[PDB]
DNA sequence: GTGGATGCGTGTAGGT
DNA sequence: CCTACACACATCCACA
């Protein structure tokens, strides 16, 4: 894991994107390698192309959590497979949707631990009472076209 | 290790 | 709507 970084601008700030050539190590905001071109690419897609965002490739994702099966990675995968954009879902539909139904909990850490924000939709992820740096959830589910309340 | 403590949840229940 | 509470649960953390 011979680590790269790479910053990028965002409506949110900036957001330093870092990995190896194995894939996308994790994204993260402050205020060379393919993995990275295409999460670049991909983020930029989803800030002024929502449109076309799944025809955009998704980057390989390098992080540790990432390299074997965890609850978390069942999570943060299925999360990213079947909430699409503008979507939303309750800690307990994706817990249950990952498997365990009693886990919904346990969701709540795992979006806590996703190291590639926006990229997989942890912010898609409300209170099954339709509740919601909590700005920036709220930025991006506004970008998701989402009510207020 | 193991074992208790932890928190981005949720349904039930009563109170303002 | 809101504080209170009981519970289920993958992780984390401190101690052994
Ligand atoms: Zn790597």
Redesign the pocket.
Known sequence: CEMKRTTLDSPLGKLELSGCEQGLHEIKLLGGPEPLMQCTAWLNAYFHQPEAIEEFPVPALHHPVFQQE????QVLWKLLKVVKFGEVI????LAALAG?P?????????????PV?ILIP?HR?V???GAVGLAV?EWLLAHEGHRLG
Do not use: H, L
């Open positions: 965890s609850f978390t990675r309750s800690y307990q539909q365990n009693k886990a919904a909990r346990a969701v709540g850490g795992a979006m806590r631990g996703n924000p942890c992820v209170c099954s009472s959830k």
